[PDB]
């Protein structure tokens, strides 16, 4: 019943220098919210990369309303690792729900 956003796909494999696109889906619930893109560091700390209300990491909303493209522009081999998104709801209920994590390989 918590219904956290999804972070598609569990694994991106890309080549260095290439556009890498995750897609974070926050179902409906589009009245007062902020959407963060995170990457985990070796020490399991969470680093913000971009946010939907806002240049290497771009987050763009899709026509859907519910789907968001979270993309690395110039892929690298140290840009490589594990990522997730967080949905911050402000109304009706104050909430953060984070997606499950996915891997970027490049």
């Amino acid at each position: 019943p918590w219904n956290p956003p999804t972070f598609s796909p569990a694994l991106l494999v890309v080549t260095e220098g290439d556009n890498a696109t995750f897609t974070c889906s926050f179902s409906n619930t589009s009245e007062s919210f902020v959407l963060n893109w995170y990457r985990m560091s070796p020490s399991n700390q969470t680093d913000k990369l971009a946010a939907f209300p806002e240049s290497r990491f771009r987050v763009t909303q899709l026509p859907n309303g519910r789907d968001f493209h979270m993309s690395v522009v110039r892929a690298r081999r140290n840009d490589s690792g594990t990522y997730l998104c967080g949905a911050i709801s402000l109304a009706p209920k104050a909430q953060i729900k984070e997606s499950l994590r996915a891997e970027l390989r490049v």
Partner: antibody
Framework: EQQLVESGGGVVQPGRSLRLSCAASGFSFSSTYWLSWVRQAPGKGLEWIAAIYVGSSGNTYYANWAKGRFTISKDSSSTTVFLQMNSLRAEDTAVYFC??????????????????WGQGTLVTVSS | AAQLTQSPSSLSASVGDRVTITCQSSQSVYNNNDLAWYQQKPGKPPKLLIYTPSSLTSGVPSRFSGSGSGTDFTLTISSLQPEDFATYYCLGGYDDDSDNAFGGGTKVEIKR
């Protein structure tokens, strides 16, 4: 190194107002965080008053009993949150804590996840 | 309007004892588990013990566990330690955050 420090407590006379401050250290107010005021009268239990989303939108959340008598506000530029307390009455004598909720990596966050606290400031309402 | 009842108001136990503290809500908490438990010691701010909706990876020793869903919640200390004597508080969150409230607290004191 993250810290909350409450100030502005002291003796206040009944029927008057008092503004309290919560000064945060070690983090910025852009997003994922709410600051809350919680109070505790001498020898009694904890009581939640209100919360504010730090960050542009600035949404406020007020306990039912506190609505219309307390006002919470923020100043991102000095990472400070304010609690305005009006029509003070004797039963308002208490220690006032501010507490933070939110972050990243914890999976789910709500206003019940208060994981960072100040030491609190004593307000005595008395003539 | 939500009212959150905590029981008992105080109890006495010995080190090693199992203690259960219960917390009951007028209405279902948010998503049936927006409920937390806090430990407070005299003169000190409260400390978060259990965050039900996503069990902490913090330093709660195994002896602390929460159970319950919806309107009735339990905090269990399976093997009470000297550092556990303190007052414990539940905190409930609701569809409207304006209803959020603490229970009245449970003081756990040393039996003799």
């Amino acid at each position: 190194e993250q810290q909350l420090v409450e100030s502005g407590g002291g003796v206040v006379q009944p029927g008057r107002s008092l503004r309290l401050s919560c000064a945060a250290s070690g983090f910025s107010f852009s997003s994922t965080y709410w600051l809350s005021w919680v109070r505790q009268a001498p020898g009694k239990g904890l009581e939640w008053i209100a919360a504010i989303y730090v960050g542009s939108s600035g949404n406020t959340y007020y306990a039912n009993w506190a609505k219309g008598r307390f006002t919470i506000s923020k100043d991102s530029s000095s990472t400070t949150v304010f609690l305005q307390m009006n029509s003070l009455r004797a039963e308002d004598t208490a220690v006032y804590f501010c507490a933070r909720a939110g972050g990243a990596g914890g999976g789910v966050y709500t206003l019940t996840r208060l994981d960072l606290w100040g030491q609190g400031t004593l307000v005595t309402v008395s003539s | 309007a939500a009212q959150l009842t905590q029981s008992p108001s105080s109890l006495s136990a010995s080190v090693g004892d199992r203690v259960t503290i219960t917390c009951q809500s007028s209405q279902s908490v948010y998503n049936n588990n927006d409920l937390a438990w806090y430990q407070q010691k005299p003169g000190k701010p409260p400390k978060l013990l259990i965050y039900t909706p996503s069990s902490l990876t913090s330093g709660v020793p195994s002896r602390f566990s929460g159970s319950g869903s919806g309107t009735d919640f339990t905090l269990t200390i399976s093997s009470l330690q000297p550092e556990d004597f303190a007052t414990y508080y539940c905190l409930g969150g609701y569809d409207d955050d304006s209803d959020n409230a603490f229970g009245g607290g449970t003081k756990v004191e040393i039996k003799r």
